[PDB]
């Protein structure tokens, strides 16, 4: 597997002109999936990471925006990265997006990290674009290869024992961090329970404790749930993604939680910015923002 | 279409 060749071809389109595809070979992509899978399984399902690093939220196949995020933040390994999931579906270039991310994981496995989002899940792919993209540009066997890799992604990260990171949010079933550690891979995303909630739940200003989620799955959680969680586990911040936010980032619960969303002008249906969070050596947080067009 | 579009 020639990682540098692959990365070079993926980066060739920098400076376009969003639209131009990068079409790797089927064998190359299979290799990216198999090798990255191995690395994911070799590392904990609950990552323990060090600052400084950059944290990114949803990308959703907006490949040319991913390239802008790296241009702003430094291409790996110039900065360490943690992505919070939702690499595929909705956008025009999910394949380029996930392939560059997997290539970087293989090249820089101790300095580049990818968590699982609710879209790194076959039943959601089937509906929201990635299955169709794979069928059109490759074949459904390659889609299954991707799913097999997704099924091995880690689920959460803690940065320097103080910033708890996950795609969706908290769970009414999350009492101990060991519950996350015990989760065996490969696994699908279940339609209920801890793993589901970590990838699906949302904060809500109008809910006291736990509430119904209008997505039809998981829950919403209020500010007091966040406060209690941070106190119980001696954390300073929850960092999550999963919801489009106008500024690209948005604080909740007296700045005890932040939502990151990194795909600007999402679906061409929102006028949102995309943000990446810079976490310095002392865990101070700042932002790099792709303003809407 | 809320799955979120
Ligand atoms: Cl796009
Ligand atoms: Cl398509
Ligand atoms: Cl649930
Ligand atoms: Mn999501
Ligand atoms: Mn998303």
Tokens representing residue A291 in the block: 């303003």
The residue among A109, A107, A89, A108 whose CA lies nearest residue A98 is A89
Q: Tell whether A267 is within 8 A of chain B (Cβ).
A: yes
Q: Strand A163-166 vs strand A237-240: parallel, antiparallel, or unpaired?
A: parallel
**What is the Cα–Cα distance from A284 to A278, expressed in whole angstroms?**
8
Inter-chain touch B3–A243, beta carbons under 8 Å:
no
**What is the Cα–Cα distance from A100 to A254, expressed in whole angstroms?**
36
- Ligand 1 centroid distance, CA of A32 (Å): 22
Q: Tell whether A200 is within 8 A of chain B (Cβ).
A: no
Write b or e for each residue in A188-222: b if 16 or more Cβ atoms lie within 10 A of its Cβ, otherwise e. Answer: ebeeeebbbbbbbbbbbeebeebbebebebbbbbb
Q: Strand A163-166 vs strand A202-203: parallel, antiparallel, or unpaired?
A: unpaired
**What is the Cα–Cα distance from A7 to A2, expressed in whole angstroms?**
9
Q: Is A242 flagged in the annotation as binding?
A: yes
Q: Is A164 helix (H, G, I), strand (E, B) or coil?
A: strand
Dump the DSSP string for A170-231.
--TT---HHHHHT--SS-PPPSSSHHHHHHH-EE-TT-SSEEE-TTSSSEEE-HHHHHHHHH
**What is the Cα–Cα distance from A95 to A130, expressed in whole angstroms?**
8
The alpha-carbon gap from B3 to the nearest alpha carbon of chain A, in Å, equals 5
- Ligand 5 centroid distance, CA of A90 (Å): 9
Q: Is A15 left (phi over 0), alpha (psi -120 to 50) or beta?
A: left
Inter-chain touch A128–B3, beta carbons under 8 Å:
yes
Q: Tell whether B1 is within 8 A of chain A (Cβ).
A: no
The alpha-carbon gap from A174 to the nearest alpha carbon of chain B, in Å, equals 23
**What is the Cα–Cα distance from A218 to A240, expressed in whole angstroms?**
15
The answer for residues whose C-beta is within 8 angstroms of residue A42's C-beta and 6 or more apart is: none
Residue A57: how many other CB atoms lie within 10 Å? 30
Query: Alpha helices, DSSP H only, in A138-181?
Result: 140-150, 177-181
Sheet containing strand A112-114, edge to edge, reads: A112-114, A81-83, A53-56, A274-279, A285-290
A16 HSE (CA, 13 A, CB side): 13
Q: Which residues pair with A238 in a beta bridge?
A: A164, A257
Query: What CATH number matches the domain at A1-293, 3.40.50.10790, 3.10.450.750, 3.30.70.100, 3.60.21.10?
Result: 3.60.21.10
Q: What is the DSSP letter of A116?
A: P
Name the residue with tokens 């899978």: A37
Q: What is the DSSP letter of A75?
A: S
Contact A207, A83 (CB under 8 A): no
Residues of A in contact with B3 (CB under 8 A): 124, 127-128, 215-216
Q: What is the DSSP letter of A268?
A: G
The answer for residues whose C-beta is within 8 angstroms of residue A184's C-beta and 6 or more apart is: none
Q: Strand A163-166 vs strand A156-159: parallel, antiparallel, or unpaired?
A: antiparallel
Of all residues in chain B, the one with the smallest CA distance to A266 is: B5
A239 HSE (CA, 13 A, CB side): 33
**What is the Cα–Cα distance from A87 to A95, expressed in whole angstroms?**
9
**What is the Cα–Cα distance from A198 to A239, expressed in whole angstroms?**
12
Residues of A in contact with B2 (CB under 8 A): 214-216
The answer for residues whose C-beta is within 8 angstroms of residue A254's C-beta and 6 or more apart is: A223, A227
Structure determination method: X-ray
Q: Is A160 flagged in the annotation as binding?
A: no
Catalytically active residues of A, by annotation: 119
**What is the Cα–Cα distance from A178 to A199, expressed in whole angstroms?**
17
Name the residue with tokens 């389109």: A13
């Amino acid at each position: 597997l020639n990682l540098d060749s692959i990365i070079g071809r993926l980066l060739e389109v920098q400076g376009s002109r969003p639209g131009k595809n990068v079409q790797l070979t089927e064998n190359e992509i299979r290799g990216l999936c198999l090798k990255s899978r191995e690395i994911f399984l070799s590392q904990p399902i609950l990552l323990e990471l060090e600052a400084p690093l950059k944290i990114c939220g949803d990308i959703h196949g907006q490949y040319y925006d991913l390239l802008r995020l790296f241009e702003y933040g430094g291409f790996p390994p110039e900065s360490n990265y943690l992505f919070l999931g939702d690499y595929v579906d909705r956008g025009k270039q999910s394949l380029e997006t996930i392939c560059l991310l997997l290539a970087y994981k293989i090249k820089y496995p101790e300095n580049f990290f990818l968590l699982r989002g609710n879209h790194e899940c076959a039943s959601i792919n089937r509906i929201y674009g990635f299955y169709d993209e794979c069928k059109r540009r490759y074949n459904i066997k390659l889609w299954k290869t991707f799913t097999d890799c997704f099924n091995c992604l880690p689920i959460a990260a803690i940065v320097d024992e103080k910033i708890f990171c996950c795609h969706g949010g908290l769970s009414p079933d999350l009492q101990s961090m060991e519950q996350i550690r015990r989760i065996m891979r490969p696994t699908d995303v279940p339609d209920q329970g801890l793993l589901c909630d970590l990838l699906w739940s949302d904060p809500d200003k109008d809910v006291q404790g736990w509430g119904e989620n209008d997505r039809g799955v998981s829950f919403t959680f209020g500010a007091e749930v966040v406060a209690k969680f941070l106190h119980k586990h001696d954390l300073d911040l929850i960092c999550r993604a999963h919801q489009v936010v106008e500024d690209g980032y948005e604080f909740f619960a007296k700045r005890q939680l932040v939502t990151l969303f990194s795909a600007p002008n999402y679906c061409g249906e929102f006028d949102n910015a995309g943000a990446m969070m810079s976490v310095d050596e002392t865990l101070m947080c700042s932002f790099q923002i792709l303003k809407p067009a | 279409x809320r799955x979120x579009x």
